[PDB]
Amino acid sequence: MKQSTIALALLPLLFTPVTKARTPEMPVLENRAAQGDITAPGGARRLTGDQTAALRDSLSDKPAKNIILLIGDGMGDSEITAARNYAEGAGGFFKGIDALPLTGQYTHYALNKKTGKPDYVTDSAASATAWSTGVKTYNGALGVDIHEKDHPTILEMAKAAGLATGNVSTAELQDATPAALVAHVTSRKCYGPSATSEKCPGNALEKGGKGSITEQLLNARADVTLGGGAKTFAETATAGEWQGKTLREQAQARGYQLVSDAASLNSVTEANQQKPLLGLFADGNMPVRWLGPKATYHGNIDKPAVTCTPNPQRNDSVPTLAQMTDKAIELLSKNEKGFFLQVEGASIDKQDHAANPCGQIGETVDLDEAVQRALEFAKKEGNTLVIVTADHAHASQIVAPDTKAPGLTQALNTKDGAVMVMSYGNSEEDSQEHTGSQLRIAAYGPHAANVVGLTDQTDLFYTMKAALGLK
Amino acid sequence: MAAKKDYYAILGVPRNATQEEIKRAYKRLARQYHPDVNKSPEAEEKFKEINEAYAVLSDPEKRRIYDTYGTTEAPPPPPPGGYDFSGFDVEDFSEFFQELFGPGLFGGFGRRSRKGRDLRAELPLTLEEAFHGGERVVEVAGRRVSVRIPPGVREGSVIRVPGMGGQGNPPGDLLLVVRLLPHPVFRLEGQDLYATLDVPAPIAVVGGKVRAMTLEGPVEVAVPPRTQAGRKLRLKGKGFPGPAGRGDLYLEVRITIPERLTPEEEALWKKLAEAYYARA
Amino acid sequence: MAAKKDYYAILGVPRNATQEEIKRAYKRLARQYHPDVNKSPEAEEKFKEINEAYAVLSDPEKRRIYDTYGTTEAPPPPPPGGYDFSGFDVEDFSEFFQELFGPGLFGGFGRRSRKGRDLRAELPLTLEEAFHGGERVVEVAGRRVSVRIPPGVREGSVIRVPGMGGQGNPPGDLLLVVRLLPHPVFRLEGQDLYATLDVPAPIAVVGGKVRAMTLEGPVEVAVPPRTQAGRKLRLKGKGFPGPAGRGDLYLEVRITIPERLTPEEEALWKKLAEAYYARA
């Protein structure tokens, strides 16, 4: 339609939204129908072997490397000093409780040197322990979990522990150099409580079990390869379900390929492993990371209306629901006596002995949230688009299908259709030949080389491949 | 005033007991003296003494506070927030406890004793390490304490830890607002994720395969014959872990082209373009 | 005593003069007797009478109040808010003004012609009108103001206009921070337009003409070659004058594919997809 004329906001108040059909968190839907999930029989990480490649070679990067970053040196020490211990304190006097913890700069302990080069596969790790894993205990009832308040307290010291390393990893454990998990208060910023989480779960720590052993942190080796090892992918349909995937693999090419299918036009290029049924580089998105956080919204603050939450078990089933018994753990029957324990420095306190699940660690816990970790917030959908993003149609322009129904028309939801039709919209869009037309496309593609040469400078390159599209 | 209660003896473990076996003794007496299971105020106060001993012998920090007590004699300096007492009625514990944790005695079930300092902490975390998470110790507001948070998180969103915040009776608790790394692809809702899949136009039309790199392993996505951008996947059992299985990864389809082509490729793409121009 | 201030003659125009003639009259006298440059009492009091004249004849309603007065004898009823007097010196101007507009001289909640305070508001403005440039009918708080927007007015442009701010007879010094509409084509920000382009894969790679909507109607735009989804197509000369001389356009690419296919086209698409996937 023809809006043209306008109004003003004034900012007298903040317009609150209207509630819609949302949150079926009360009749629990298990969602295990056509789930697949555990289809591969165990699988695990395939990390083991009587040494396989990299021995002697190990990729020689960095000038010796040896003690990575924190070399220190002492007599040639610089820069890194200012990062931490830029003062020391007192060489002796009181502060100097030691002076030489290096001991001739590292004696024959075993090899030392850090580096992280000799081997990446030769280990006795079962390669199933991917750091840790926990479910939401049981299916239960779900719902009730809201809680969210805000914070009268913000900021602290800083504690930018790791800031690049730490609890980062890749699929499996690859590094662990923070405080332990993380460490600090909201010391940079905070969006909002019920803005980002209308329902923050927390009472859901499952159970755990079958452990009593965790000393083998090394899944693979160290730093560069501390986990994963080898996880190949090649299967008909490991995806799931969407739109209408008829079970068809396709995409083979093998028909002629001029001379032969296996490379043919190329013999070898370093290693690469490109043209191997799928590879090159591919896979966009990768870091993604949006700089636009939509909104902060500091509202729906405190609201201590949550009655049920500080109750540690009351009217429950029994703390023997989750797995009942995993093995034993409490009575492990390992040794006839409580070890030898003479003087091991201390006792084996460790913060651990056999882990052993807490009383009612995961089974309802009155609130029921022990078996829940939210479910609804904003699935988004997106199919609400296409239906005139100006006037919203409101019959007339389109009356019979509001949305979902478009099936005879096909297109299947669509959502991304900012043009398609849009313009005119059964209304008087005058248009005519006007000055607004003025355009000159300078997007990627028509730049340099063919256009007006490279540029008006000695900045010029012969980088133009004809037979293959390459820079 | 110097009425040192032996927390090991309160739980019935020896002066050598491991933190884990201390917790075993807790579980025994947490079943025995459980407030609502055993309808006896007597047993609730005894349960408080069980929760007192456990309050000081639960986590690495508190454990070593007691272990260093009787070497150190001065009570620990107040952590800017308070001493956390998740389900532990600090206010009704011993005057010895009121020495050792005095400057930040919380007020858990003291009915007013403080207003809960709602301790909201931001944390740099990964999606694969959201999947991992587990039983780990965090230092927030000068206050080191361990928790097993439910494996799973979404950018900017909040993880609750009930009771484990600053001083108060009305639950202040710990509120972990996650700061995801340069990798926030998988946006969580419950167990279900929301990422974006880079699908080539030719693969989208034939219904071939495109790899989505997931938390526990790289899944190879089977695409239907002819897929548009804006379509959505639900990869069954590729979310965060649940009782019946993992949630569903929701992938937003992008139809994308490799820009650069071979003479063969580009020729057929131009014949498709000619088929399009022929529609006008 | 109803001393008929001939607002036209004050502006130096006849009693048949339109809002246009009132406008250029005011501007002529606003440059000539410009009190910021020509700080001389005579020229400044005279200038304020030119602002009395303009005050009444700026806004469509207040305009019609003058026009009807001397045909109708009763003062035309005050809008829901009162009679605006955009930062003009009420207590110095004519009896005629203060008797005609007297019954509803605004004053916010004071009513006795008190001044309005500075305020900041968001002006949601139609993209088409932002191109054209001229007087804009903005109605809010009872008042319908005619604010002349700059030709090619861009996001965050603050029009400091008294009359729509704090409540008063000469109402508040408002800051119109221009927010251009969620109109389905563009959002002009900085100097350049932000739009969306849903384009099919053959036309994206090869670079064919689609119908791209513009502020004065849709035009045929030959899409650049090798156009990939998730990217922004820079089309220069589409955006408005600013830092970059003139601004660009940035089209948010969403590539689609035909969905419905006939055997031969499907054979070409698959042969692309096979020689792609297998030989990636």
TrEMBL record, chain A:
Cofactor binding comment, as recorded: Binds 1 Mg(2+) ion.
Active site: S124 (phosphoserine intermediate)
Organism listed in the record: Escherichia coli
Residues holding Zn(2+) 2: D73, D391, H392
PANTHER family xref list: ALKALINE PHOSPHATASE
Domain of life: Bacteria
PROSITE patterns membership: ALKALINE_PHOSPHATASE
Signal peptide positions (record): 1-21
Protein name, per record: Alkaline phosphatase
A GO CC term assigned to this protein in UniProt: periplasmic space
Subcellular location: Periplasm
Positions annotated to bind Zn(2+) 1: D349, H353, H434
This protein's record includes keyword Disulfide bond: yes
GO MF annotations, alphabetized: alkaline phosphatase activity; metal ion binding
InterPro entries for the chain: Alkaline_phosphatase (IPR001952), Alkaline_phosphatase_AS (IPR018299), Alkaline_phosphatase_core_sf (IPR017850)
Known EC number: 3.1.3.1
